[PDB]
Amino acid sequence: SPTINFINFNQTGTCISLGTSKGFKIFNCEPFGKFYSEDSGGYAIVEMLFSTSLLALVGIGLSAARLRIINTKKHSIICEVTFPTSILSVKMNKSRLVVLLQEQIYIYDINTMRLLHTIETNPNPRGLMAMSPSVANSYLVYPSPPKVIKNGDVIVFNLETLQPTMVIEAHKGEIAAMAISFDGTLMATASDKGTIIRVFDIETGDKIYQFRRGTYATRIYSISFSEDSQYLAVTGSSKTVHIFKLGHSRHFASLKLPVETNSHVMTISSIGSPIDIDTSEYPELHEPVMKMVPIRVVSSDGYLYNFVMDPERGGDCLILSQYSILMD
Amino acid sequence: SPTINFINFNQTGTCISLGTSKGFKIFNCEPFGKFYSEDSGGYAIVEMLFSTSLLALVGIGLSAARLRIINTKKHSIICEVTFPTSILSVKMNKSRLVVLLQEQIYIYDINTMRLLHTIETNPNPRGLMAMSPSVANSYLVYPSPPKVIKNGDVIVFNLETLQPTMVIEAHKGEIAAMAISFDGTLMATASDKGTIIRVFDIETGDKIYQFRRGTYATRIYSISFSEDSQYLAVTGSSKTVHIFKLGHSRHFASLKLPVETNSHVMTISSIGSPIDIDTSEYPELHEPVMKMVPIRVVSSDGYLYNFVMDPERGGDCLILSQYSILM
Amino acid sequence: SPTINFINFNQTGTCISLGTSKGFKIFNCEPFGKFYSEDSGGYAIVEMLFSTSLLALVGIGLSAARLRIINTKKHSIICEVTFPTSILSVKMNKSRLVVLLQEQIYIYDINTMRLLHTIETNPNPRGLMAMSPSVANSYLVYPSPPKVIKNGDVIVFNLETLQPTMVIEAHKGEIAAMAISFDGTLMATASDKGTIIRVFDIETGDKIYQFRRGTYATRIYSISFSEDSQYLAVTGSSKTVHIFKLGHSRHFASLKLPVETNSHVMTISSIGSPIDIDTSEYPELHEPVMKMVPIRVVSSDGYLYNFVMDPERGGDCLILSQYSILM
Amino acid sequence: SPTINFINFNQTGTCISLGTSKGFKIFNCEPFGKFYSEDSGGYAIVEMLFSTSLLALVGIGLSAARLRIINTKKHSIICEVTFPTSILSVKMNKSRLVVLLQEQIYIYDINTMRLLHTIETNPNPRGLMAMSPSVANSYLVYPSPPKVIKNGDVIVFNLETLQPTMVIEAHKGEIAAMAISFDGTLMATASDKGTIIRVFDIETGDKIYQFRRGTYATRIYSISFSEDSQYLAVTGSSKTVHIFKLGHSRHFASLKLPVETNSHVMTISSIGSPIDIDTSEYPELHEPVMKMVPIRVVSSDGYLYNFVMDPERGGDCLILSQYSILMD
Amino acid sequence: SPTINFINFNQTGTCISLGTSKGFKIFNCEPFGKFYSEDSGGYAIVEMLFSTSLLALVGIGLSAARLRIINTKKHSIICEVTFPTSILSVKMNKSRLVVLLQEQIYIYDINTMRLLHTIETNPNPRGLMAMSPSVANSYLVYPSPPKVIKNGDVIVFNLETLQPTMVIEAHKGEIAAMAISFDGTLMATASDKGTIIRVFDIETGDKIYQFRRGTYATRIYSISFSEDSQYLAVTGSSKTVHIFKLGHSRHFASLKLPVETNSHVMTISSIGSPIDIDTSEYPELHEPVMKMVPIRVVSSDGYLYNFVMDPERGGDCLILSQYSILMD
Amino acid sequence: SPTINFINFNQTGTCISLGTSKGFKIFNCEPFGKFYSEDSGGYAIVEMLFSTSLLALVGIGLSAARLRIINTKKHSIICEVTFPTSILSVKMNKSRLVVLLQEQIYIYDINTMRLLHTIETNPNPRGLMAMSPSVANSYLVYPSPPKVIKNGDVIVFNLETLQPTMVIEAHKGEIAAMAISFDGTLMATASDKGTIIRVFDIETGDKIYQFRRGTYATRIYSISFSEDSQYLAVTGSSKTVHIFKLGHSRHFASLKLPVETNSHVMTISSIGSPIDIDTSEYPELHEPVMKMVPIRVVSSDGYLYNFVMDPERGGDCLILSQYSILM
């Protein structure tokens, strides 16, 4: 079993991207299957648009500096761009392409592929970003630490006009994770303590929600919004996933992975639109069918976990199935 | 009489820097005199610190891109730095040195002279900034127009920590002039129409005062605060200089230059601390001495004009004397 | 005594430019003196125009690629230009500026300083050119070897119209030195063996004179014409300088340096206009005064040697005096 | 009927290339037929080697900047090279490939396809070139106008050693057309007046022949040598084609197109080796067969015209047939 | 090493055709080399004309019923013709193309490719044929067994006029092999016993020569004439090749394959025009050079064997070299 | 009186088959009578076996392509078979059934009626064959002209083994009529000019006899042998029937029809075994009885003519009686 270095959902959560030390893979979620694969070499960043057969490939070191965009349906190379330093993150929408280095931000137009704007930012060794995926509210946010309490400063940058809009005084400590909703309305961040989750409304700048996560300080791996902006997902080193309800404190519902899973695994999750499931097959503990929110949690060990959450009851979520990436 | 391309006061307003097409000169204000001069070449930017024998010299194009730092007392060269494009503005405090190109901002430590930060901004063909001269509140502000209504966006940048603090939605149109008080507390901005003057409190961001300037729209050359932040001075193409009182609308007092003066003159001004003047010599229209704020207005034609303002009466200001720079 | 890396006369031969590992110096010839000097850094190319306080300064590697134009009277910088590779030669007239890299030629207008033309040539590791200093016949010639017998092909390029005029099949072997007279009428070339010196008439292209140099093949350092195109001076590794008379084969007159001189010295020379010298002081072997052509030969060890040639007698030339540059 | 933008014979004159706004076509001459076609898009330059299934494709704007080499028999792409500006001409021999922009010349080796030499020339908005098609005498000539009487300067460049050989003082006015014989021995040029045709011997530089063309000044569209260097063909805006005999003034023989043809049409021609025709079928006005020089003249309207010339009589040439390109 | 299903010389013996289960190959004989190849699939019949880049391809099952004619130089398909049953043999000359099924004969004109004549013959499971390759004497002969001693009846069919010419009472038993000389003058046949070889003159019908082959009855694989009609070659299951002289019984000269070769291999041979060889290199056991008849024997295992025969001495033939088909 | 399209004897010559445009009829020869008749439709081919109540019926176009086998005694249908084109000839023996189209020959087993063989021949628009009626020597012969001098090539085909035996180069011109004796021993052929009659021995292939017919070339309608192969009968457009004696040139005996007969009549004949006739009734010009070979000649106009030939005298033959078929 080859080691994997990167997992990432698309901007809608209906697909899967992945990068191994021997190649990369592209899966699908509802009619599960291996859509694409290529065993060329180690890949560290595999980012794709809303399907559309568009990919962004960063080699593990094709070095980590070079970024290559490949159209999988045409099997051709759109362009290749090099960078002075290793790439730390690449994110995309159907309007702009952004490449982030440790102290610089590069912004490209996805169509023309010509360089547009460059931001000189204070060092970000963690490669933290968040991009609104919609063109109507195209906003990019990056942290602004002081150069050596005013450490958790985040710069709200509008990609449409290529000018900053405001400065958000997010937290006292360094930012550890950040995400933007699908429509670009909201924003969520968390310090390196992972104890307090804060939600700011990007257009006005007001803090809307403040959630407490866990009891003691522990690392946060990633944050992701629901597609309908109803729920927010956080994953940490405690091998537990929390879901906070944004329909408005304590986490609304929690996901516990199977015990056999090792605790030293990074997990990214995604929340999908509610679906109907047959209660006859699953003794939830009854109407024949009731709406269940499906949750997909994939870990760096190469597994996929499917949960269902009751929007009213919440609580601990039942687990339906456990596929295995890199195999059937 | 050689043509002059650049005039500015020092950060305290007690000195004069000037650049001709043949060299640069340095003057003084109260015991007027010519401290230094060199007939080296064309100079476009001659900026000085709080005396201290430190200068920034930019050639007319010594190219326009090159910047040279010279100690006038030692007649030596501290350093020499080049830039890919022509320099548009240079400002200093006793802690940081800022060089602005049309699209880039370079910040240097005044002591070590090593580069500290670089800012990629939207193009500024007008070379507009404002630098707080005090190290306690060292702030830099530069405009951020959208790249091709929200055209008059300005970025409040902190030099101490090298991180921006906030974004101020100053005006609807493009910014034309910026000025920061001596202590770095306030910032004043002017749109390209020069009809509304707005001053913001830099730490909070709230607009404190709003001034109406003149009757019709006309260009603004420069803005400058008083040492004690009591008054604000603006000069425009109407050949008239206005003084706005910040002790708290309409201009408090107006400076009318002599009629024979050319109308197409760049005019910069400065406000000094109140001093005692004898009313026996000057029929102000009476106690023997009364405090009157002295104002120095140097124009691009090469003349200095001294005025006095009565802080209570205000109104049209009397002119005492006129020298002639370059002579 | 710092090492020196570059010596050349001006386009009239009445001045000296020189570059050390610590700075550059500028001298004069008839009333000998040191006009200028700076201990800035290593300089590899120091080229001057017809006095006029204009210089081209190239750092030893200020990198070798960078070229800086400095006005010594104003102590300012006209401009600063970089190149992808190290500069190999720089020459000027009062109309054009030429910068040569190993495979590229850049031509600049001396006044506006904007780029005018670029020539892609076959590699020239020796950095060889020749520039006519008069604007009436402004010509540039550079060698064009085949890219890997016809190896000594040289391209006659007109700077005025920026179009080549003709191709001269100069020599069978690679070109080693090129020189153009003051008026731009003639061009002289030297093969890598230094045995045959050929001069061509640039407008017609016909070889006018052919000179045999020395007895055996040896390297040639530089060639230079007289102001009136009467004589041609070549210097080689044999520590001997030859003068060929163009008033029309064998060298007309030979310059033998003092024996104590090191043999491994780069030697450049120049020929000046005839002057009156007193035979009473100098027993030439007699009228009190007779015109004798003065020759100045500066070597890489740092010394200047003054000779005189009798235009009718020719022959071995007497040496009058010796100074010491850098002292 | 789609509009066509480019017509060009091969280096031997036994084939035809063509480019439309919808695709390109490749014909043949003696056993006439449509050898190849591809309706991809607009093409502006279609240049091919001596058969050998080698092509050079320049899109109308595959932009005009990009040049693509396609092997029609293998249906694959050998390589793709981009250029900063739009391409104005591409010519080839079995040794070198040259791409010309408005102020630059690029020279490539046809086999290795690596860049060899670059010439910085004065602006040529007309895209004028001439290449000897034989490797024994590989010479390339381009005009050298002054940069703003010495306007008609042409630089004779040897492609083998990549060094200029001489400078030719061709004409007083700007050069309008130029061509090189098959063996690379001769050269022919004409100013923008089109009144005087001059022939220079490329190896020595001497002007060998000087022909007068027409009476009043009129534009010249193209010049082409005969394969055996016996005759030279010029075509102008007068809807008339002249042939000058090089076996050595006034044009030896002239070709008049049918009256129905519009005068605002560009025509390129080619001269083939002499062939035997039966005088019984054609009342020339008699031996049964006598040698006739065949001439093929194709116009931008999409037609082909076949003429026969008597090398001794010359004069106005009889027209045998009139095919139609884009159809049968 | 892929298995091969078909080997056949051309009508002159100067080339080689071959068909594998993965593709087909085309070799050459005197300047030995691999002229062509194509790894598409299994091929059972690969027949080619006198060079001329013409091929006949029958798939192993492109089924065995379908026959496809491909021009290897043009890489195109001339035509495709289907048949109700599997093809058993295809032979060609520069005038006619004949396709044989188990009970039917189809004759086509090679140029026009339209059907001309069809012969309804009694069943021939062995696919036996013989065609004169010259247009002057275009004769086709096929066996005519009785439908269930008069079993070895062969019908002499003239392809030019498409009418039978005579009936030959060849042998008492079933015919096993048959061949026609290059000029179409002679004919040779052999029964399934392989003991007696009979030669009939096709124009008159008289039996000219009768040769005894071997001692006991054994199978005969193929018969081939010399180009000059001087010698006749037979190959059997005894791993031995006999040559009978037609300059006029017992075989004149015999060819013994190397012992390492397996006996269960089918061998086809061909006789070429006499050539000069240097006796200095080869100690034949002496003039420096003497004429030797070269013989090429290829077996179904994938090897080629070159022999030399002395026309006067005959006897056992020396073997010069042993190439290897499917490799160098 | 309906038109008649087809007349032929049986394989023994003791019966008559006939086809009208309204139906078919079957007669007898020695005790003359009408055995059978049906007014069904137009019939073009009515062929019978050796009595045995077996018939082959082809419609006039029951299309011309269709063939129907009918048993007249049972009034039933044995089978029905169609063909892609119109049938041109049908013949039988007691072992095989042959159907000929213009370019194809079909052979059927008379008993099982399953198809046995098919022959692809060059086109025969005249529908010519010859069938041996004995199973001991069952042979079929059909012409093989070249497909567009050797035009009269005929193929000897053996029905028993279904394989051809030999090819006979019969005549230079196209074959016009073929006939095989009762035992299948001999075959007779006639060219389109009808001048030369050739008979070949089918087993050996050698031409045995050659007969000259008439004086000038004229068409031949049919040929038929005697039962004992003693005589051969040919009928042509000259309204004269010739008898050639094969007991071994010029015709042995000639049959002249009555003058009133139409000249444009298809005439077929047959030769029977010798019988005893009374010379008292017939003045032959005498023993009371002498054997005379009876000849029956039925013509397309619908009449039967009875002749007698003296085997020794030969010569012109006397006519005894005339009936009228269809009445």
CB contact B62 to C (< 8 Å): yes
Is F321 buried (19+), middle (13-18) or exposed (0-12) by CB count in 10 A?
A: exposed
Q: Which residues have CB under 8 Å from C272's CB, separation 6+?
A: C13, C14, C29, C227, C293, C294, C295, C296
According to CATH, what is the number of the domain D227-328?
2.40.128
Q: Which residues have CB under 8 Å from A252's CB, separation 6+?
A: A231, A243, A244, A245, A314
Report chain C residues whose CB lies below 8 A from the CB of B38.
75
CB contact B163 to A (< 8 Å): yes
Write out the two tokens for E30. 């005197």
Q: Which amino acid is at F11?
A: Q
C144 → closest Cβ in D120, D153, D163: D163
d(C-alpha F309, C-alpha F292), whole Å: 6
Write out the two tokens for F322. 């005339």
CB contact E163 to F (< 8 Å): yes
Report chain C residues whose CB lies below 8 A from the CB of B2.
none
Classify strands A43-48 and A55-59 as parallel, antiparallel or unpaired.
antiparallel
Nearest Cα to Cα of residue A72 among A103, A44, A94, A40? A40
d(C-alpha B49, C-alpha E222), whole Å: 110
Q: Which residues have CB under 8 Å from C283's CB, separation 6+?
A: none
Write out the two tokens for D302. 């999409």
Specify the residue for token string 């430590």: B109
What is the assigned CATH class of domain C1-87?
mainly beta
Q: Which amino acid is at B226?
A: S
Is F216 buried (19+), middle (13-18) or exposed (0-12) by CB count in 10 A?
A: exposed
How many CA atoms are closer than 13 Å to the CA of A196, on its beta-carbon side? 13
| Concatenated DSSP letters of A30-91 | TTTEEEEEE-SS-EEEEEE-SSTT-EEEEE----SS-EEEEETTTTEEEEEE--SS---EEE
d(C-alpha B236, C-alpha B194), whole Å: 8
Nearest Cα residue in chain C from D149: C161
Q: How many helices (H) and strands (E) does chain C have?
A: 0, 29
- The three-class DSSP label of residue A204 is coil
Put the strands of the sheet holding A33-38 in their side by side order: A4-9, A15-20, A24-28, A33-38
Write out the two tokens for F200. 């070949």
Q: E162: phi > 0 → left, psi -120 to 50 → alpha, else beta; which?
A: left
d(C-alpha D289, C-alpha C177), whole Å: 67
Q: How far apart are the first and last CA of chain D?
A: 13
F147 → closest Cβ in E117, E119, E147: E117
Put the strands of the sheet holding D220-225 in their side by side order: D220-225, D231-236, D240-245, D253-256
d(C-alpha F52, C-alpha A286), whole Å: 93
Handedness of CA A254, A258, A259, A261 (dihedral sign): negative
Q: Which residues pair with A290 in a beta bridge?
A: A277
Shortest CA gap D172–chain C (Å): 15
Contact of D92 with D47, CB cutoff 8 Å:
yes
State which approach was used to obtain the coordinates: cryo-EM
Q: Which residues have CB under 8 Å from D114's CB, separation 6+?
A: D108
Q: Which residues have CB under 8 Å from F196's CB, separation 6+?
A: F171, F190, F210, F211, F212, F213
Report in angstroms the alpha-carbon separations of F259 from A324, F176, F239: 112, 27, 9
Put the strands of the sheet holding C163-171 in their side by side order: C130-131, C139-143, C152-158, C163-171
Q: Which residues pair with C267 in a beta bridge?
A: C299
d(C-alpha B174, C-alpha E21), whole Å: 79
Report chain B residues whose CB lies below 8 A from the CB of A122.
162-163
Report in angstroms the alpha-carbon separations of D32 from B54, B244, D27, D276: 86, 91, 7, 18
D122 → closest Cβ in C122, C147, C163: C163
Nearest Cα to Cα of residue C271 among C315, C326, C234, C313? C234
Contact of D34 with D16, CB cutoff 8 Å:
no
For residue C113, the Cα-to-chain-centroid distance in whole angstroms is: 23
Q: How many helices (H) and strands (E) does chain A have?
A: 0, 29
Is E259 buried (19+), middle (13-18) or exposed (0-12) by CB count in 10 A?
A: exposed
Q: Which residues have CB under 8 Å from B195's CB, separation 6+?
A: B212, B213, B214, B216, B217
Nearest Cα to Cα of residue B70 among D296, C76, F289? C76
Contact of A238 with A194, CB cutoff 8 Å:
no
d(C-alpha C51, C-alpha A53), whole Å: 67
Contact of C154 with D163, CB cutoff 8 Å:
no
Shortest CA gap A167–chain B (Å): 5
Write out the two tokens for B229. 């932040």
Phi, psi for A64 (deg, rounded to 5): -65, -30
Report chain D residues whose CB lies below 8 A from the CB of C155.
164
Q: Do at least 3 CB pairs under 8 Å connect F with A? A: no
What DSSP character marks residue A284? -
Q: Which residues have CB under 8 Å from F40's CB, separation 6+?
A: F23, F24, F62
Q: Which residues have CB under 8 Å from C75's CB, separation 6+?
A: B38, B40, B41
Phi, psi for E282 (deg, rounded to 5): -110, 110
Contact of A244 with A251, CB cutoff 8 Å:
yes
Q: Which residues have CB under 8 Å from B27's CB, separation 6+?
A: B15, B16, B18, B33, B34, B35, B325
CB contact B42 to C (< 8 Å): yes
Q: Which residues pair with A25 in a beta bridge?
A: A18, A37
What DSSP character marks residue A130? E
Q: Which amino acid is at B99?
A: V
Instruction: Tell me chain A's radius of gyration from C-alpha atoms.
Output: 19
Nearest Cα to Cα of residue E144 among E158, E163, E129? E129
d(C-alpha D192, C-alpha D237), whole Å: 12
- The contacts found for B210-218 with CB under 8 angstroms, 24 or more apart, are B210/B249, B211/B244, B211/B249, B211/B250, B211/B251, B212/B249, B212/B250, B213/B242, B213/B251, B214/B238, B214/B240, B214/B242, B214/B251, B217/B193, B218/B194
Q: Which amino acid is at E214?
A: G
CATH architecture of D94-217: 7 Propeller (2.130)
Q: Which amino acid is at E16?
A: I
3-state secondary structure E84-144: CCCCCEEEECCCEEEEECCCEEEEEECCCCCEEEEEECCCCCCCCCEECCCCCCCEEEEEC
Q: Which residues have CB under 8 Å from F312's CB, separation 6+?
A: none
Any idea where the domains of chain A sit in the sequence? 1-84, 218-328
d(C-alpha C309, C-alpha C296), whole Å: 11
Element (H, E) at B245: strand B240-245
Phi, psi for A156 (deg, rounded to 5): -90, 110
Contact of B199 with B166, CB cutoff 8 Å:
no
What DSSP character marks residue A302? T
Q: Which of B161, B162, B203, B204 to mutate to test the interface with A (most CBs of A within 10 A)?
A: B161
* Other Cβ atoms within 10 Å of E212 Cβ, number: 13
Dihedral over alpha carbons F105, F108, F110, F111 (to 10 degrees)? 180
According to CATH, what is the number of the domain A1-84?
2.40.10.480
Shortest CA gap C309–chain B (Å): 43
Write out the two tokens for C120. 């892609």
Nearest Cα to Cα of residue C57 among C71, C72, C46? C46
Buried b / exposed e along D157-170 (16+ C-beta atoms within 10 A): bbbebbbbbbbbeb
Report chain C residues whose CB lies below 8 A from the CB of D164.
144, 155, 164, 167
Write out the two tokens for B283. 């029929």
d(C-alpha E26, C-alpha E36), whole Å: 5
Write out the two tokens for D129. 């070139």
Q: How many helices (H) and strands (E) does chain B have?
A: 0, 29
Contact of A302 with A316, CB cutoff 8 Å:
no
d(C-alpha B296, C-alpha A21), whole Å: 72
Q: Do at least 3 CB pairs under 8 Å connect B with C? A: yes
How many CA atoms are closer than 13 Å to the CA of B225, on its beta-carbon side? 27
Query: Beta strands of F137-282 (E only): which ranges?
Result: 139-143, 152-158, 163-171, 175-180, 186-191, 196-201, 207-212, 220-225, 231-236, 240-245, 253-256, 267-271, 275-278
Contact of C4 with C266, CB cutoff 8 Å:
no
Nearest Cα to Cα of residue A17 among A40, A51, A64, A41? A51
Write out the two tokens for D231. 């005759």
d(C-alpha A306, C-alpha F127), whole Å: 86
Q: Which amino acid is at F121?
A: T
Work out the widest C-alpha separation in chain C, in whole angstroms: 62
* Other Cβ atoms within 10 Å of A141 Cβ, number: 26
Contact of E15 with E29, CB cutoff 8 Å:
yes
d(C-alpha B309, C-alpha B311), whole Å: 6
Q: Which residues have CB under 8 Å from C88's CB, separation 6+?
A: C100, C101, C102, C124, C125, C126, C127
Specify the residue for token string 């094709």: A62
What DSSP character marks residue D214? S
- The three-class DSSP label of residue D65 is coil
Size of interface C-D (CB pairs under 8 A): 49
CB contact F124 to E (< 8 Å): no
